[model samples]
Target: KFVYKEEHPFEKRRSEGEKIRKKYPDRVPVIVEKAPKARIGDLDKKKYLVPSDLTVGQFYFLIRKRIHLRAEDALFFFVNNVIPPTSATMGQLYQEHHEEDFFLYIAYSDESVYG
Candidate 1:
């Protein structure tokens, strides 16, 4: 089964950024790549526009769903290599941890969530 849901007729014309921006005016754009400590796959980095109001936990689930992950699949996120609480909002987290150029570099853990 594929995770990709068919886009609505109106949704077809929107760019990735535009789609997110339309609904979430307060978005924090971030470049996501794996940390050295957790790198395992040959996954390419991606630019994600995160809703400011979304919790870290919500953000994690969003990515998982985007990639068609099942509940048993393991994924973990860290803000610039520092682990953050899942309850934290992307808005406040990005505001506090962003580096130069306003890009939030999030690291993903490919190692077992529990090993």
Candidate 2:
């Protein structure tokens, strides 16, 4: 069966030093690629397809096991900060491309009700 996914939208705005100084007092924005994509293929593939019979806690454990710490750290910051994902941020790193499928995947990433 073909599975359809939705894309999640995220955007990271450049924070000026003055703004940082005013808001954070001691912190400044670091130069890094913003809203990096967490690839659908790269996501814990096995957990991605968990069966309906599995308990929520069991399913969460399975999915958590697959999260790469480095990637998870990035995602945590994005979701917590409300950063919008660019086409490149959603896993299409080669070029500027936007797809609803990618956004759907992002939607799932940004919010999880299962806990």
Candidate 3:
């Protein structure tokens, strides 16, 4: 199973962003997935159009809702491999970490303290 970027070339992904942004001006194009070693179940889907002002914490809950994990099960997210502040809105994070393809890619993982 390839990640979206691995499956699509630059132009293809860029075209997708172009069309998506044009259609949804106030929304950010986002794709969410599990980290390579994540033990959690997969999300129902990867594509999401998030509102610009929505906070990262809110988005985290949105994703958590889909996976139906227990309340105590900790989740962590990364954008461009760097964890972003939960208080930041999607628009801020997108502008900071978005790839050339124009989609804000995020990866989530469960707690890694079991070492």
Candidate 4:
């Protein structure tokens, strides 16, 4: 699984996430990365300050656009190795899978089976 924690120090990421959250209470700190072994190109930016009320399905569309992928391309999202509910709000997903670093991590893959 590709994760932000691998490249960044835990405390540094935690403090940054907290600082961002302190400044934007209505948004959730998010880090989106390409899954290990995924064939698609990575997003131009990994960090996103997503609106809390945004649903996973809505966020998926934004990600798809960011990648510039067409409808025919396959893209799947997983949070902590588990597929998240499309209808669940970002706030709800964060509440469930946020790590000690405070950012909600999302992994995207072009294939259904991923690390």
Point to the candidate with the largest lDDT.
4
In candidate 3, position 27 carries an lDDT of: 93
lDDT of candidate model 4 versus the reference: 0.89
Per-residue C-alpha lDDT of model 4 across residues 3-110, encoded as one tens digit per residue:
578788889999999998899999999999887677897799998999999999999999999999988999898887788888999999998998888899988998
Each prediction's whole-model lDDT (CA): 0.63, 0.29, 0.84, 0.89
Q: Where does the lowest 10-residue lDDT sum fall in candidate 1?
A: 1-10
lDDT of 2 by residue, 55-104 (tens): 33343343444554333542322322333333122222211222222221
Q: What would you estimate as the lDDT of candidate 1?
A: 0.63
Model 3, stretches more than 4 Å misplaced? 112-115
Candidate 2 wrong stretches, greater than 4 Å: 1-48, 68-115
Clashes (backbone N, CA, C under 3 Å), per candidate, total 0, 11, 0, 0
Q: What TM-scores do the predictions have?
A: 0.63, 0.25, 0.90, 0.92
Structural RMSD, model 1:
9.3
TM-score of candidate 1 versus the correct structure, residues matched by position: 0.63
Give per-residue lDDT, candidate 4, residue 39: 84
Q: Give the least accurate 10-residue stretch of model 2, judged by summed lDDT.
A: 1-10
After aligning candidate 2 to the native by TM-score, how far in Å is the CA of 115 from where it should be? 17
